[PDB]
Design a protein around this ligand. Structure first.
Ligand SMILES: NCCN1CCC(CCN2c3ccncc3Oc3ccc(Cl)cc32)CC1
Length: 270
C-alpha cells in the first residue's frame, strides 16, 4: 500500500535520522515528506506493536494544529519503518535560512523564537520532550511565515525525574549533561532555546567546545540589544534552577509585541 498511495520524489537529505524524500499523496496531491528509519539504527522503542519512539511522540503531538510537523501515516517494512510527514511548500529549514541571510534582525528573531516557544510548550503539554531543538530541526513555511518542529527521533516522554541518556546535538546540550551526564527535561530545553536564540541573532552558535559550554560565558560578535542579551544569558544560566521557565521567557521585555506569522512573512520573507 505504501508504494501505490505515495509518489516518491527527490531525496531531501540523510543523516543520523535516516533518509527523507519529497513526496506526493496520490489521493489528493498533498505534498508530503517520506522518512525511512532502519530498524537496526533504532535504539529507542515504544508501544501503542513495537514502533520507534518517534511514532509514539508524534501521535501524542499530531492532534489539532500546532508548530509541529504532523505524522500523517506510517508503515512497517521488514528492515525499516516509513513515516509520512507534512511538507510545507515552499519551505526552508532555519539552518539554511541563517546560512544564507546571516544574523537575523531582532524583529524577525522575535517572531521565530516566539513560534518555537509555542511549539515546544505544545509538545510539553502533550507529554513530549523533543531533546534536539536546533536550527536544522525547524522548518519555515516561507509563504505563511510559520515555523514547524521536525525530527522527534531523539525525543522522549516528558517526566519530572532525571534523564541520564542523550542523543541530541552536543553543542546545544547543557553543562549539567557535559559534566554529570544528568539533566531535567524542561531546563535542558531552556538551555537549547538560549543557544538557538543566540544563533538567530548572531548567525552562529555561541559555544564550540565542552570547556566553553561549562564556562558558559557568552560573547556577542554582532550588535544585539541589551534586552535580547539579557534573555540569552538568562536561558544559558549554568545552574538549571537559575534558568527561566517558558512563562518567564514569554513575559520577558524582549518578547513583547511579536509580529504574527503572516506579517512576518510579508515584511521579511516575501
Ligand atoms: N541544511 C538542510 C539539509 N537537509 C537536512 C535534512 C532535511 C530533511 C528534513 N526533514 C526531516 C528530518 C529529520 N526528521 C524528520 C524530517 O521531517 C521533514 C518533513 C518535511 C520536510 Cl520538507 C523536511 C523534513 C532536508 C535538508
Amino acid at each position: 500500500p505504501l508504494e501505490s498511495q505515495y509518489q516518491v520524489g527527490p531525496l531531501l537529505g540523510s543523516g543520523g535520522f535516516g533518509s527523507v524524500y519529497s513526496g506526493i499523496r496520490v489521493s489528493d496531491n498533498l505534498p508530503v515528506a517520506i522518512k525511512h528509519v532502519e530498524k537496526d539504527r533504532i535504539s529507542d522503542w515504544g508501544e501503542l506493536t513495537r514502533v520507534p519512539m518517534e511514532v509514539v511522540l508524534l501521535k501524542k503531538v499530531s492532534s489539532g494544529f500546532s508548530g509541529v510537523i504532523r505524522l500523517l501515516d506510517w508503515f512497517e517494512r521488514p528492515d525499516s519503518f516509513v513515516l509520512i510527514l507534512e511538507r510545507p511548500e515552499p519551505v526552508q529549514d532555519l539552518f539554511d535560512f541563517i546560512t544564507e541571510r546571516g544574523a537575523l534582525q531582532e524583529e524577525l528573531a522575535r517572531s521565530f523564537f516566539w513560534q518555537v516557544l509555542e511549539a515546544v510548550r505544545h509538545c510539553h503539554n502533550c507529554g513530549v520532550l523533543h531533546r534536539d531543538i536546533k536550527d536544522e530541526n525547524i522548518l519555515i513555511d516561507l509563504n505563511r511565515g510559520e515555523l514547524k518542529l521536525i525530527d522527534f527521533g531523539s525525543g522522549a516522554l516528558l517526566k519530572d525525574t532525571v534523564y541520564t541518556d542523550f542523543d541530541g546535538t552536543r553543542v546545544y546540550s547543557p553543562p549539567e549533561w557535559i559534566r554529570y551526564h544528568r539533566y531535567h527535561g524542561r531546563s535542558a530545553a531552556v538551555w537549547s532555546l538560549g543557544i538557538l536564540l543566540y544563533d538567530m541573532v548572531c548567525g552562529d552558535i555561541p559555544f564550540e567546545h565542552d570547556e566553553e559550554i561549562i564556562r558558559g560565558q557568552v560573547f556577542f560578535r554582532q550588535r544585539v540589544s541589551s534586552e535580547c542579551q539579557h534573555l540569552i544569558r538568562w536561558c544559558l544560566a549554568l545552574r538549571p534552577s537559575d534558568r527561566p521557565t517558558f512563562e518567564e521567557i514569554q513575559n520577558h521585555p524582549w518578547m513583547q509585541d511579536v509580529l504574527l506569522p503572516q506579517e512576518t512573512a510579508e515584511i521579511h520573507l516575501h
